Design a protein around this ligand. Structure first.
Ligand SMILES: OC[C@H]1O[C@@H](O[C@H]2[C@H](O)[C@@H](O)[C@H](O)O[C@@H]2CO)[C@H](O)[C@@H](O)[C@H]1O
Ligand code: NA
Ligand code: NI
Length: 150
């Protein structure tokens, strides 16, 4: 249910980096609506510990749709500017020139991600979700809205 969803941020310029307005406790939703442009090779939604660039902030949850060949979604965690073990989901619901609604649900033990009303993937927590205070969106993607349900 998307009641309690409050959209902030409309049509942000990409790259977008913004502070998350509350702690990502179990039951929290992050809802991102947009489109993949026709020339898209990849984009990413990063749940970050801070917004530092040098050194690069840790990414607790890197959610990275890629579109070359059959496409996929790579999920991973960045710590001390080093990527961890990749979790690759090959059944991607993203397609160039198609719209999407990403819903990231924060559970106690994992993120549960649904795209356009259909379950997409799970990703177990590698960093405590309380350390997540920043949402980054990078790459070839168009964003209409970003909202949260706490
Ligand atoms: O793990 C996410 C991370 O991947 C990097 O690229 C990987 C690539 O996904 C992997 O299949 C290949 O074998 O090695 C590369 C390691 O650099 C990206 O450069 C980075 O942006 C992240 O998306
Ligand atoms: Na990256
Ligand atoms: Ni549109």
């Amino acid at each position: 249910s998307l009641n309690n969803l409050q959209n902030i941020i409309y049509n942000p310029v990409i790259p977008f980096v913004g502070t998350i307005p509350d702690q990502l406790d179990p039951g929290t939703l992050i809802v991102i609506r947009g489109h993949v442009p026709s020339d898209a090779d990849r984009f990413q939604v990063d749940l970050q510990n801070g917004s530092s660039m040098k050194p690069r902030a840790d990414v607790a949850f890197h959610f990275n749709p890629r579109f070359k060949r059959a496409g996929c979604i790579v999920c991973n965690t960045l710590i001390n500017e080093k990527w961890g073990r990749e979790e690759i989901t090959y059944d991607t619901p993203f397609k160039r020139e198609k719209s999407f609604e990403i819903v990231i649900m924060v559970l106690k033990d994992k993120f549960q991600v649904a795209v356009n009303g259909k379950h997409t993937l799970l990703y177990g927590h590698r960093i405590g979700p309380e350390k997540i205070d920043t949402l980054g969106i990078y790459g070839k993607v168009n964003i209409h809205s970003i909202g949260f349900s706490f």
